[PDB]
Amino acid sequence: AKALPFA
Amino acid sequence: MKVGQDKVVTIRYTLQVEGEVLDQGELSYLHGHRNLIPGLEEALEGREEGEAFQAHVPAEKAYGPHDPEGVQVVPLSAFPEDAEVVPGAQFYAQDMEGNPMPLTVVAVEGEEVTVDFNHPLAGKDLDFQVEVVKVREATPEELLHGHAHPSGHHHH
Ligand SMILES: [Cl-]
Ligand SMILES: [Mg+2]
Ligand code: NI
């Protein structure tokens, strides 16, 4: 969820 | 140097969904500490600096399936009274200790707003183009904190 790349 | 556990990895990427570029940018992350969506970390594993490739990551290995329980029906009062409460508008709720929780407005009717707390990419398969810009070992401080210094997007 908060994990990137986070578009 | 190759991407692997406990390396700080810098990547440049393009993110497309259903053939539309949604995002481009550059970020650094500590590999092996669940800092990146899992399908992407799996695609980067063992890649050499300078490698550039394209990768398809199913929703299951990206932001997860869309969770129906993340869709709520809330009072239209909770929104500012001059706010544009409209499909696609983003707002942030706050819980009892102040944590911001983003939501997207889905529908509005009467005194009721259907809102979605899901990640906007939940349920979507992602197509990436990725370039491995740099790989280095992490410092003790980084390994102790579980993240890189600095930790995120150079450019977004
Ligand atoms: Cl990180
Ligand atoms: Mg280049
Ligand atoms: Ni807390």
Numbering used by the authors:
A (entry chain D): 6 to 12
B (entry chain A): 1 to 156
From the reporting publication:
Peptidyl-prolyl isomerases (PPIases) catalyze intrinsically slow and often rate-limiting isomerization of prolyl-peptide bonds in unfolded or partially folded proteins, thereby speeding up the folding process and preventing misfolding. An example of such a protein is SlyD (Sensitive to Lysis D), which consists of an FKBP type PPIase domain and a chaperone domain, called IF (insert-in-flap) domain, that has been shown to exhibit chaperone activity. Each of these domains contains one binding site for unfolded proteins or peptides. Often, FKBPs are linked to an additional chaperone domain that can increase their PPIase activity by up to 200-fold.
Although most of the protein–peptide complexes did not crystallize or yielded crystals of poor diffraction quality, we succeeded in structure determination for four complexes of SlyDWT with bound substrates: psWT, W4A, W4K, and M8A. In all structures, the peptide substrates are bound in the PPIase binding pocket with the proline residue in cis conformation, coordinated by the previously observed protein–peptide polar interactions, namely N35-L9, I37-L9, Y63-F11, H119-F11 and Y92-F13. Although all peptide substrates bound to both SlyDWT domains in solution, the chaperone domains displayed no electron density for peptide substrates psWT and M8A in their respective crystal structures. The absence of these substrates in the high-affinity chaperone domains can be attributed to high dynamics of substrate binding and serendipitous blocking of the binding site by neighbouring molecule of SlyD in the crystal packing. An interesting exception to the coupling of the substrate affinity and protein activity is the mutation M8A that slightly reduces the peptide binding affinity but significantly increases the protein activity. The mutation of methionine 8 to alanine removes the hydrophobic interactions mediated by the methionine side chain, as is visible in the crystal structure and thus facilitates proline isomerization. Thus, the M8 side chain of the peptide substrate has an influence on the enzymatic activity of SlyD, which is not caused by a change in the overall binding mode of the peptide. Finally, the loose conformation is defined by the newly determined structures with the substrate bound only in the FKBP domain. In these structures, the access to the FKBP binding site is not restricted and the peptides bound in the FKBP domain can freely diffuse from the binding site upon its release.
